[PDB]
Design a protein around this nucleic acid. Structure first.
Ligand SMILES: [Mg+2]
Ligand SMILES: [Mg+2]
Ligand SMILES: [Mg+2]
Ligand SMILES: [Mg+2]
Ligand SMILES: [Mg+2]
Ligand SMILES: [Mg+2]
Ligand SMILES: [Mg+2]
Lengths: 107, 26, 50, 99, 62, 538, 71, 59
RNA sequence: UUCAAAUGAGAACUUUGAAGACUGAAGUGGGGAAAGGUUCCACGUCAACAGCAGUUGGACGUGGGUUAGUCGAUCCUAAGA
């Protein structure tokens, strides 16, 4: 099922106590795990702009909350082992506070 | 052998009139 | 060295021309017992010692 | 944009008709050599069947040195049976040979 | 594909380091065809290869 | 799909080809037969003049209305044993003399460039407009000139195996033309020849050609074909460029082996209306063959040190083929300019002289020829690097050879099917099985031909025409007819020959051939053949 | 080597190790009937001598290449 | 193939010198061809002919 | 150290792009002397080697490349032989 939603992820409690050299890579892995939890897809692809947003303040300066646009779409290749995958994009907003999970109508 | 049979067959097989033009240069 | 003598350069040229594996048609000869180049030299394995 | 798109037209030619889907048209060499480039390894063997036979012979011959993990024909490092500096030890109260 | 040689040739032709040379990631085959400095010059002219600007070291605070 | 414009382009190409053939026939007759001309023209001079004539005649037709046009087949003049590819450049005369010094006089005509009496001169040329190709090839005979007669005429007719080959080629050409024209009128097919309700088949084509060749004691050279022609697909390079779809009948050493034992071409097709067919036939004389043997081809190289044979021809081919599937950026500026000029040509074989800006000459001048040679020097310089990177290939020079069957049967090949020529530059001739049932490859066959002491060469006669099978809507007179774009009694008129062989009237195929000839001659209740006429010059 | 023919009117030869520039120039002039502008030489890493022979402006190295046979 | 010593011995000095020069020119041409064709058997017989001519001249 | 795409049967390690960092001109920069001797560069290419991997390589296979009247040697003499 093709679908698209917007979420807020709390990276602060997921990176609590993490060594400084591992904070941004662990944020990447936690975002992949977050998308897998919310979409049931083992194949999660992060946008390079999202990677820039994660790494913007260095290896140990990840933001507490991130606003993500997650799209579950169809894998068109025959050789792929899964028919669906998730694609995570950044939602650059004024603030990531006080936002709820919403559904984006696809046109 | 099929090659032997083929070679044997080939070995056994190999073992007025007309006038065109005329006295001129076309 | 960059500024080398002609004797050294000539020995280097002979070594360069010797640096090769066997020609493949050697292996096809009758009663051939040579199967590899047992005197092959590489620049990082055995030094020529001038 | 419509004017630019209508200007950018693709018209097929004889090259597109004849070689549009075809490839090669020339046998690729085993060592990636040019037309008049000498091949030291393979010039003495005219036919590819004997080339493949010679290649198989060389690959079968290579197996023992591969098992011995030689870097090549030029890797002929020889180890001694015993090292005297390792088997010549009587360590008194004084100067030693290693720390 | 492997464009290490093309990146080195682009750096030498443009006159800057390899850190200042941008190869178009969409014209991979076109770059891979360029085996000569003349072809690299053609690519620079038509915009497949671009010279980046220097990183700023401002002196305003100084 | 035939149409008015397509038919007009085909007709214009055929007219230009016929005019060029008339031009070369007149030039050769003036040079060697009438002897009015003071200076005797040579083979490279004739080829260059023909190419310039074709370009100057084509310049006036379909200007700014057709994207691509030019010479399809470069003018080729083949003598006796040479079966094709002989179009030497003007800057190779001294090279040929130096290469072939100390050799025999068997190829003396080709080496010197001057024709000799009794020679079979095969002239081949093709013209394409918008990819629609019309090709002609005619064998003629060079004769000594009578002196007592007031009128220039030969002293006598051609006698022997050359006459046999010329007669076989001419009869096969006319019979195949009539048989293909019978496809538009299937009810006019003779019953003894084939099914009244059945159409024209490659099996019938092959059996007619083989019957004529066997009657005249000639073999079919492995280059002969009767195939279908489309746009930009005329078989201008059949042994070089591979094709996705093929519809025709071919002759090879495999076919000779199969007849003896009795992309891939097959004789399992029916000739259809609204189609264009090219018929190229080469007959090799078997007069000197006292045994039963195999007809094959020998490729001519430019290396004099490869052997010590006295009767070996050393030459460099004059035509090249561009491989548009291969791309490589050249290091030489001259090479890059030459590659741009070559790409401007198209997908047909070209000469290096064709790429000069001076060519074709407006007024034939010595200074113009000198400028052409000066351009050719740098063209050779660029071509050396172009060919070194497999961007262009050569159209080979081939000589018909005869190899007896007993030598082949007594030969041993330890590899069999697995053997192939790994040093071949071209893929298609490199991986070939001329004897699939015996498991003898091309390299093994060449080895046997070189090793045999009784491997002789065979004179070859060639006839090649292009025809269109116009239906009722296409044709002018509301009835289907065969438009012969090249050939006929005006351009390809047979020479004075006499042969001791003839078709045997006690055979069903021979009776069918006779009925085909009678129906072709009948213009009222028989077949309708319309021949393309050459355009006038002065 | 073929680039130098069109770039500087220069022929490239392999010559004997015992030959000097005078002998190379004289041999080229004798064998090909061309005037030699200058000669540069080097010893290759395989032990043979390479000579860059530049002819004068009156002669073209392209003609000599076409005469020799390599082009 | 190649030259024969007994046929060479019936000639004069200038004829042998001309034959030697012609053989040297042929050897140069064969060495030019060898750059394109690695297998050229005629080189051996030309070399042996040169050696035989020199031998007869010295004799 | 991370993201995407390409190549590939196979990508943590190859290529390009996008990011985060480091050497911080007494450099992880640009040249040389001794020494090494082709390791330089291109094409092809993965059995063995690169204490994981490898489509990559200073590896394997085939070639290309070092141009001087003015830069050195060559000449002079030093301790010395
Ligand atoms: Mg802790
Ligand atoms: Mg020097
Ligand atoms: Mg620090
Ligand atoms: Mg720092
Ligand atoms: Mg390992
Ligand atoms: Mg390297
Ligand atoms: Mg190497």
């Amino acid at each position: 099922d093709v679908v698209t939603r917007e979420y807020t992820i709390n990276l602060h409690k997921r990176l609590h106590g993490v060594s400084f050299k591992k904070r941004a890579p662990r944020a990447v892995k936690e975002i992949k795990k977050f998308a897998k939890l919310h979409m049931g897809t083992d194949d999660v692809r992060l946008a390079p702009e999202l990677n820039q947003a994660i790494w913007k303040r260095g290896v140990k300066g990840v933001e507490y909350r991130l606003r993500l646009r997650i799209s579950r779409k169809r894998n068109e290749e025959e050789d792929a082992k899964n028919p669906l995958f998730s694609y995570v994009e950044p939602v650059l907003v004024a603030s990531a506070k006080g936002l709820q999970t919403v559904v984006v109508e696809e046109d | 052998s099929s090659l032997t049979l083929v070679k044997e067959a080939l070995w056994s097989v190999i073992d007025q009139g007309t006038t065109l033009g005329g006295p001129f240069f076309p | 060295a960059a500024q080398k003598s002609f004797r050294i350069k000539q020995k280097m040229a002979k070594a360069k021309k010797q640096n090769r594996p066997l020609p493949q048609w050697i292996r096809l000869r009758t009663n051939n017992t040579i199967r590899y180049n047992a005197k092959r030299r590489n620049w990082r394995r055995t030094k020529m010692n001038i | 944009q419509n004017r630019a798109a209508r200007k950018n037209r693709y018209v097929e030619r004889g090259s597109d008709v004849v070689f549009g889907d075809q490839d090669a048209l020339t046998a690729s060499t085993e060592n990636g050599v040019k037309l008049r480039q000498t091949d030291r390894l393979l010039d003495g063997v005219a036919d590819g069947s004997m080339r493949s036979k010679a290649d198989r012979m060389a690959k079968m011959e290579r197996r023992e040195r591969n098992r011995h993990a030689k870097q090549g024909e030029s890797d002929r490092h020889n180890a001694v049976s015993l090292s005297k500096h390792l088997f010549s030890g009587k360590r008194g109260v004084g100067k030693t040979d290693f720390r | 594909a492997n464009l290490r040689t093309q990146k080195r040739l682009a750096a030498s032709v443009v006159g800057v380091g390899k850190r200042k040379v941008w190869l178009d990631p969409n014209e991979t085959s076109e770059i891979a065809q360029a085996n000569s400095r003349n072809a690299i010059r053609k690519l620079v002219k038509n915009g497949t290869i671009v010279k980046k600007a220097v990183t700023v070291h401002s002196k305003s605070r100084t | 799909i035939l149409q008015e414009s397509v038919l007009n382009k085909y007709r214009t190409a055929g007219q230009i080809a016929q005019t060029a053939l008339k031009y070369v026939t007149s030039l050769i007759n003036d040079s060697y037969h009438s002897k009015t001309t003071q200076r005797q023209l040579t083979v490279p001079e004739l080829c260059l003049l023909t190419d310039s004539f074709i370009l100057t005649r084509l310049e006036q037709y379909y200007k700014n209305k057709v994207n691509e046009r030019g010479i399809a087949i470069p003018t080729t003049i083949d003598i006796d044993q040479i079966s094709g590819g002989w179009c030497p450049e003007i800057d190779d005369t001294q090279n040929l003399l130096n290469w072939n010094k100390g050799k025999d006089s068997t190829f003396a005509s080709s080496v010197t460039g001057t024709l000799r009496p009794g020679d079979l001169v095969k002239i081949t040329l093709g013209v394409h407009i918008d990819g629609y190709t019309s090709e002609v090839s005619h064998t003629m005979v060079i004769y000594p000139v009578d002196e007592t007669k007031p009128i220039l005429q030969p002293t006598g007719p051609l006698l022997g195996g050359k006459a046999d080959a010329v007669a076989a080629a001419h009869i096969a050409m006319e019979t195949v033309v009539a048989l293909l024209a019978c496809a538009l009128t299937p009810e006019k097919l003779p019953a003894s020849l084939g099914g009244t309700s059945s159409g024209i088949t490659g099996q019938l084509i092959r059996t007619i050609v083989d019957t004529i060749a066997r009657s005249y004691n000639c073999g079919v050279v492995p280059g002969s074909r009767v195939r279908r022609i489309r746009r930009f697909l005329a078989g201008q390079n059949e042994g070089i460029v591979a094709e996705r779809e093929y519809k025709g009948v071919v002759w090879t050493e495999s076919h000779q082996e199969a007849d003896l034992l009795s992309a891939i071409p097959s004789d399992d097709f029916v000739v259809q209306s609204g189609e264009v067919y090219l018929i190229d036939l080469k007959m090799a004389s078997l007069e000197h063959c006292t045994k039963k043997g195999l007809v094959t081809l020998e490729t001519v190289d430019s290396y004099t040190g490869k052997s010590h044979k006295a009767g070996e021809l050393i030459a460099r081919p004059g035509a090249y083929v561009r491989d548009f599937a291969q791309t490589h950026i050249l290091k030489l500026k001259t090479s890059r300019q030459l590659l741009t000029k070559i790409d401007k040509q198209g997908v047909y074989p070209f000469k290096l002289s064709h790429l000069s800006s001076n060519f074709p000459f407006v007024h034939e001048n010595e200074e113009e020829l000198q400028s052409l040679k000066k351009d050719l020097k740098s063209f050779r310089l660029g071509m050396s690097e172009i060919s070194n990177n497999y961007l262009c290939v050569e159209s080979p020079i081939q000589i018909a050879r005869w190899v007896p069957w007993d030598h082949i049967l007594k030969a041993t090949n330890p590899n069999g099917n697995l053997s192939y020529d790994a040093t071949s530059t071209l893929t298609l001739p490199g991986h070939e099985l001329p004897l699939p049932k015996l498991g003898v490859s091309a390299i093994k066959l060449k080895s046997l031909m070189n090793s045999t002491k009784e491997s002789i060469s065979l004179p070859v006669a060639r006839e090649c025409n292009t025809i269109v099978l116009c239906d009722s809507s296409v044709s002018t007179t509301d009835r289907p007819e065969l438009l012969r774009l090249t050939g006929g009694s005006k351009t390809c008129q047979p020479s004075w020959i006499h042969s001791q062989h003839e078709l045997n009237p006690q055979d069903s195929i021979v009776q069918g051939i006779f009925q085909l000839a009678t129906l072709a001659k009948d213009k009222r209740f028989g077949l309708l053949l319309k021949e393309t006429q050459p355009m006038k010059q002065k | 080597a073929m680039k130098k023919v069109e770039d500087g009117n220069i022929l490239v030869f392999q010559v004997s190790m015992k030959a000097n520039k005078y002998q190379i120039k004289k041999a080229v002039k004798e064998l090909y009937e061309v005037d030699v502008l200058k000669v540069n030489t080097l010893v290759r890493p395989n032990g043979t001598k390479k000579a860059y022979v530049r002819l004068t402006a009156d002669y073209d190295a392209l003609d000599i290449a076409n005469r020799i046979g390599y082009i | 193939a190649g030259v024969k010593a007994y046929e060479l011995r019936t000639k004069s000095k200038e004829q042998l010198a001309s034959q030697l020069v012609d053989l040297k020119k042929e050897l140069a041409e064969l060495k030019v061809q060898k750059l394109s064709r690695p297998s050229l058997p005629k080189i051996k017989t030309v070399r042996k002919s040169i050696a035989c001519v020199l031998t007869v001249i010295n004799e």
